[PDB]
Structures are given as structure tokens and as C-alpha cells.
């Protein structure tokens, strides 16, 4: 069974051992705030090794995927992917809103009992909405690789902007799409660029395999460190009802709705397909970064489910930044919970508008240093409540952030399969013309 299955067995063993190690250390030992940071050094090294692959992999994969297809074919695949993402995001938002209202988590609990912590960021609705369009078209290609644009209101008020560290993935993806479309129609005059980017994509994909050898140790030291820096278990019991709603919504959306759509569109068993990405699911659960888990998703989808490369290379990078299913559901549930906690009554129109604004703001903060805080604040401002009540959820915002990634990755795989099957005619016809 070994060699055939070594990476998955090592990852499972490391995940099992890390929880035990972390529980034992915290229980029977006392560590200072400085000593708790040196215990997670291998995890940080793994995190900053995985962050180094995102730029070349994304750029080369997007260019290669776009340039391979014809101009007429690419638009149809993009339209299908966009429609599927939008529809399932709407479905997830609806499911989350109804689920939190039905159970009624914050009817009994009062705001006074619950403590709060964290720093609420400064947020402007229209400014944040326009910052997305600004970041879609960066002023500099080199600066876009490690900086982002932000604007703030100051002084009867003026608008001033500045650049801050953080990879701009939206602008890079848009430019890669445009460049691939341009060089795909040049014919012979762009073949050198096509070959260069194909070789770069292959070389980048071969480097992740080296990191996969060190991955189990970093995973073991990464999950143990999360169970040593936990503040206390009092807040977990004080917020147990809140976590139940989000977890139930995520589980329902992952188990019922997505396989239902997959079985309706394509006539295949949807559970073996999900099993084929188990390593990707564990990677998403631990690292909890949809962008950093991209190479593992590529390897799992292409090698284990026989999905066409020309479909993954175009769909998966796009889905790495645009899919908002987990984010939108969590934000909607948390906003309704905060509204229930305070003296606010939710009507039908209020529910509809809060769902609409949650759906819009989930994708509005597509790329932000702390996007979960921006989206919640916008929804709370829309409903009336201030941004100072977001600090209640921050105490458990490190546990529910990990669960969303696996759902997003699994849904991206399902959408890749659905889009590949939905355009089978042009995939079997472009091979000869």
C-alpha cells in the first residue's frame, strides 16, 4: 500500500499526532507568549514556503490555459463558470440565512454576558466597493506583484490613497487573462511565448512536489500551535450555539446541495469525485488559504479524476479568488446572530436586503488583508448596527475560517467537472481544427 499511498498516510498521521502533542503540552506545561511563538517555527516556515509559489504558478497557469483554447471557446467556458459560481453563491446565502433564523441562536443569550476582543477596522462602503475596481486595473505591473491599493476619507471630505504590502491577485489574474487571449490569436508570432509559459508552468508544478516532502512536519507543528494559543474554553461554551449554526450550514451545503447539482448536470457518483481530493481537503483544512492550496488542488483534480487540463488551468485559478460560498454563508449567519443578540426585529424585507448586501459584500472584499472584518462591517452598517459589535465573533474567527476553505476547494473541483462536461462538444472538436 506504500508508495501507492505515502503522502496521504503521512498527512493523516501528522494531523492525528499534532492534536495529541498540542493537547498534552498546553495541559501539562506552561509556556510564555514568547515561547509559544518559537514552538510554531516549522509551521511558519512551511507557510512562507507555500506563499512563494502563488505568483508564478497563477500567472503561468492562467496564460497557458487561456492561450490553449480558441477565442470563441474561451468566452463560453468563462460564462458557464461565472453563472455557476453566481448561482451556487446565491443558493448558499439563502441556505445560511434560513438556517440561522430557524434555530434562533441569540434569543436567550444577552450581549452583556458575552465578552469581546479584537480591533475593528475602518471601513467605508462605497470606497471599499470602488477599491475592487481600482485593484482590477493596477497602475504598475511589477508593483502589483506585492502591493495593493487602499483609499481613505480624510480632511468637506477628500479621498487619499496609498499602497500597502499584499499580493494583488485580482489584477494579476485579469492581466494574465487578457495577455493569454492576445497571444493566443497571434498564431506563429506568439508560439515562443506560449512555449516559455508552458515550460514555466511545468517547472513551477515540479517544485511543489519537493515541498510536499517537508509538508507533514510543518502540518504537525502547525496544528499543534493552534491548540496552545487558544485563549480559554469559557468563550467556546459561551459561543457554542453560534459555531453550531455555521458548521451545520457548511456541512449541509457540502454534503447535499453541491452533490445534488453535480448529479443533476453529470450522471456520475459524486462521492468518489470528492474522495479523490481528500489530500486537497486536508490541505485546505490545515493551511486554510484557498490561494496557497492551489497546486495541491491541481494535482488532485488532474491526476485522480482524469479531468481535462485545459479546463482546470482555466477554471481553478479563477475560482481561487472569486468563489465566496463559505465566506458569504458565515457572514450572513453572523450578521443575523448579531442582529438577534441586540434589540432588533428582522422583517421579510429586512431579511431580503440583508441577504442581498451580504451576497454583494462577500465578493466585494475579494482580496483584503482581513476580508472577514470588512464584509461583516458592511452588512451591519446596512442593517443599522455599528461596527463595534463585530468583536464578539473575533474570539472564534480562527476556527471557522479553516472550515470554509475545504468547502471552497471541493466546490471548485465540482464546478471544474461540471464545466468540463457541459462543453464536451467543443473539447472534442477543437482537436482537429
Numbering used by the authors: 14 to 168, 199 to 476
Give verbatim lines from the article.
Human excitatory amino acid transporters (EAATs) concentrate the neurotransmitter glutamate and aspartate in cells. By coupling the uptake of one substrate molecule to movements of five ions—symport of three sodium (Na+) ions and a proton and countertransport of one potassium (K+) ion—EAATs ensure that the cytoplasmic glutamate concentration is ~10 mM, which is required for neuronal functions, while the extracellular concentrations are as low as a few nM permitting rounds of synaptic signaling. EAATs are homotrimers composed of promoters that work independently. TMs 1, 2, 4, and 5 of each protomer comprise the scaffold domain mediating trimerization; TMs 3, 6, 7, and 8 and helical hairpins (HPs) 1 and 2 form the substrate-binding transport domain.
EAAT3-X was predominantly found in OFS in NaCl buffer and iOFS in NMDG, NaCl/glutamate, and KCl buffers. Notably, we observed no K+ ions bound in OFS determined in KCl buffer and assigned the state as apo (described in detail below). Surprisingly, when we examined the OFS conformations imaged in the NMDG chloride and KCl buffers, we found that they closely resembled OFS-Na+ with wide-open HP2 gates. We observed no density in the K+-binding site, suggesting that potassium did not bind to OFS even though it was present at 300 mM. We term these nearly identical structures (RMSD 0.57 Å) OFS-ApoNMDG and OFS-ApoK and refer to them collectively as OFS-Apo for short. Strikingly, the YE/DDR motifs of OFS-Apo are in the bound configuration, while their NMD motifs are in a configuration intermediate between apo and bound conformations. Inspection of the Na3 sites in OFS-ApoNMDG and OFS-ApoK revealed distorted geometries of the ion-coordinating residues, including shifted N366 sidechains. We found excess nonprotein densities at the sites, likely due to water molecules. In contrast, in OFS-Apo and OFS-Na+, E374 is buried and proximal to G415. It is likely protonated with pKa-s of 9.2, 10.0, and 7.6 for OFS-ApoK, OFS-ApoNMDG, and OFS-Na+, respectively. OFS-Apo features an open HP2, protonated E374, and bound-like NMD and YE/DDR motifs.
